[PDB]
Every structure is written in C-alpha cells, then in structure tokens.
C-alpha cells in the first residue's frame, strides 16, 4: 500500500480527456486525447509550482477522438476519431501521414501490434477491421461476430504470439487469434455492457468492466473466471500496471486501486465537487493510467483536466 499524495492539478484545456497515452521511453512527455477533437502532448514539471503546460496539440478530426495509441516513439501516434476514421500522426513533424477508413460509423477503440505492424479498429457496426500497416484492408470477422457495438480492443504488450480480445455491448467478450482467424473463446458472465478490456503484459490477467459494475477476470490462455472481485458500480476504466501487481479501476465518480494477493484497497481516490446542498454531481472519471516507470497516477476526467497523483509513502 502506497499513499497517493496530492501533486497539484492540471488545467488549461476545454475538453473531456478520454484516452491518456504513456510512452515507456519518455517519462517527461506523454500524450492525451480529449473529445474536443484534439490530442495534446504534455510538459511535465513535477514541482510544487505547477504540474506542467501543454506542449503541442494535433487536430485532424471532424468529430471527437475516442482512442489514441503510440506506435514505438514519441514521433509517431495513431488516433481514432468518433467520425469513424483513423489517422497516423507523425509527431516528429506534427502532421498526419496516413488515413484508415473501413467503417460506416463511429470507432470506439483502436488496437496496434506490439511489433507496430497490425492495426485493429473496433467500430459500432459489429465489425472489427484488421489492417496491415502496408495499407491493405485485410480482414473483418462477420461469422457469428459481436451482435452489438465493439466498445474496446486491446493488444498484448508483451513480445509473443499476437492475441486479440474484443468487448461487445452484448454483455460478452471474444478472444481471438489473428494467425488463423478462427474463434478461440467467447465469454459471458457480466450483467451489463462492457466498455474497456485490457490485457496485462504477459497474457495472463484479463480485466473487464463496464455496466456490470464488477471487475471480471479471465486468463488469455485458460478461459475461466480467475476471481470474483467486488468494487464500485460502473467501471469507466480498468487496467493493470506493467510494473507491479496493482490493478486500477475507475469505478463511479472515483477510482480504486487493488492488489491481487489479498484483494484489498490501498488508496480510494475520490474527486468531488462539494456543494452545500444537493446541487451537482462529482466530476466522474473516464481513464486511468500509470507513468512510464509506473510510479505516478494520471486520471483523465470529464472536468476538462488530467489529474496527477504522486507516490510519497504515507
């Protein structure tokens, strides 16, 4: 258990931050996408004076941005927008070099190969579109696929055989191998639509959440409920940390961070708009992430800011 102390606050933006990107080679500059149709690179000061200032904002979207990723360097990025498009930004020059469109409606999340060679885009049209980076519209799965939207697709960050997992709004998840395009497993057990699924960087701990309100665990290579976890209702974000056994889940208008050894809460962090009466609601959280080395917590909220929490041991 580590205290999550108050580093300060970040402000100077006018949009809900939906996807926050961390590059494990630049612990000083990180990317974050906000649904005012922009994706911004931060500058990190890490002092009591101020958290930092935005560095460079890239805009290429007619509608809002849903998910973003970084390929292998702070000079590249891939961004999916709510207009159904994917754009490959070259952050060495701050422009877009390639566009990707195979969808007829919104795109919720985009995946990218750990080798930066495969692009996976999940849309609302119950089709998951998989491209090669060459520019070929290579495949979609349409035989007994997801019967609803594809809320999120995530990729294994460990160098291994690629293994996709996709969460649908039909209260089910599907884990697939794109080597043979053959169904691997279909999972049910939630009591609501899923919103985010993320895979720990070894293909062992799979985390799922959403309208079910309870985090549900599977094994990428076994296919069974790992444990029944109790938490706050409505998981707007949940993911492990690729340095330590912590799992951070954004549940309700607050966030929880748990261990898997005994399933206890180390620090329950609530961001609250306090009213003297029943007048408003707490600013709800959307996304959670750790730093490049995974010792500071970034939380993307709907109050047009990214909050930063520091490790101080308390």
């Amino acid at each position: 258990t580590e205290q999550m102390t108050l580093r300060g606050t970040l402000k100077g933006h006018n949009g809900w931050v939906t996807q926050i990107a961390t590059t494990p080679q630049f612990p000083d500059m990180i990317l974050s996408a906000s649904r005012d149709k922009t994706i911004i690179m931060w500058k990190l000061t890490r002092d009591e004076t101020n958290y930092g200032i935005p560095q460079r904002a890239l805009r290429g979207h007619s509608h809002f941005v849903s998910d973003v990723v970084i390929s292998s360097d702070g000079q590249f990025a891939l961004s999916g927008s709510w207009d159904g498009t994917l754009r490959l930004w070259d952050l060495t020059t701050g422009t877009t070099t390639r566009r990707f469109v195979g969808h007829t409606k919104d795109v919720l999340s985009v995946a990218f190969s750990s080798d930066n060679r495969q692009i996976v885009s999940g849309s609302r049209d119950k089709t998951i579109k998989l491209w090669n980076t060459l520019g070929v519209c290579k495949y979609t799965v349409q035989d007994e696929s997801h019967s609803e939207w594809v809320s999120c697709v995530r990729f294994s960050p460990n160098s291994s055989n690629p293994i996709i997992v996709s969460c649908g709004w039909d209260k089910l998840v599907k884990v697939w191998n794109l080597a043979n395009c053959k169904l691997k497993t279909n999972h049910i057990g939630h009591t609501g639509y899923l919103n985010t699924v993320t895979v720990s960087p070894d293909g062992s701990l799979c985390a799922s959440g959403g309208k079910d309100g309870q985090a549900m665990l599977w094994d990428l290579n076994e296919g069974k409920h790992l444990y029944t976890l109790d938490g706050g209702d409505i998981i707007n974000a949940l993911c492990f940390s690729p340095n330590r056994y912590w799992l951070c889940a954004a549940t309700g208008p607050s966030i929880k961070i748990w261990d898997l050894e005994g399933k206890i809460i180390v620090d329950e962090l609530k961001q609250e708009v306090i009213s003297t009466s029943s007048k408003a609601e707490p600013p709800q959280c959307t996304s959670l992430a750790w730093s490049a080395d995974g010792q500071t917590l970034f939380a993307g909220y709907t109050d047009n800011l990214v909050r930063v929490w520091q490790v101080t041991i308390g």
């Binding site: 809002f64 609302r124 939207w149 639509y193 309208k211 409505i234 029943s278 709800q284």
Partner: protein, 132 residues
C-alpha cells in the same frame, strides 16, 4: 420557447421504459444508442429525444418518473421501503391512556394491563372552533 413536445417526451419515455439499461450517461452516447434502435427520420429529432433522455435519466437519480413503468424502478422503490429499526415504534414502556379508553379496555377484559398510565382528562370542553 424551449418546451419539448409530446413527440420528444413520449418517444424518450418509451425508450427509457424499454431500453433503460441500454442508455448511457453522456448525451452523445445517448443519441448514438437512440439512433441504433429507433427509426428516427432526421438528426434534429433524434437529438431532441436523446436530450430529453438525458434530462429524464437525470430525474431518475432522485426519484421515479410518472410516465415510466420500468421494473428496476419498482425494485428500487421496494428496496427503499424495506427499512426496519431494531425497536418497533409501537414498543414503548408507558402508554398514556385516558380514563374513558381505560373503561373501554376494562369492559374488554383488559383492565389488568400494567403497561398504561393515567393521563388526566381535559379541564374543559372547549374543542369547537368559533362560529362565523
């Protein structure tokens, strides 16, 4: 004038009656889900129904909505009404009882109860409100 007509209100009512769980928390999610499962001819109308869906769901967090008959609302009402203390409000040591109801109890074979207490009758018979 920003009054929402019966078309918007009634379509939103049917949607929240029918797809209460399918709804979202953000308006932009609400319009997308509404356009998924409704033949709404135009963008403006689906926007208006989505917006009243957001307002109705905001009204849901504090109480029921009159035109909605969702099962989850009944479950919420029946859970809220399932409250009980450890001590019943009718479980009290001393019950003040007037002499006339004491005589009623005594003629009812209950004059031997020691749980009651004599409360003295009123001084006078001044209980009518003045006339005119």
């Amino acid at each position: 004038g920003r009054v929402r007509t019966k078309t918007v209100k009634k379509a939103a009512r049917v949607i929240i009656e029918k797809y209460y769980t399918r709804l979202g928390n953000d308006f932009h999610t609400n319009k997308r889900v509404c356009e998924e499962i409704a033949i709404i001819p135009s963008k403006k109308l689906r926007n208006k129904i989505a917006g009243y869906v957001t307002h109705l769901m905001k009204r849901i967090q504090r109480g029921p909505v009159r035109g909605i008959s969702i099962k989850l609302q009944e479950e919420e009402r029946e859970r809220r009404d399932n409250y009980v203390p450890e001590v019943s409000a009718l479980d009290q040591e001393i019950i003040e009882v007037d002499p006339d109801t004491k005589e009623m109890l005594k003629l009812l074979d209950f004059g031997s109860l020691s749980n009651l207490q004599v409360t003295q009758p009123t001084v006078g018979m001044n209980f009518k409100t003045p006339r005119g």
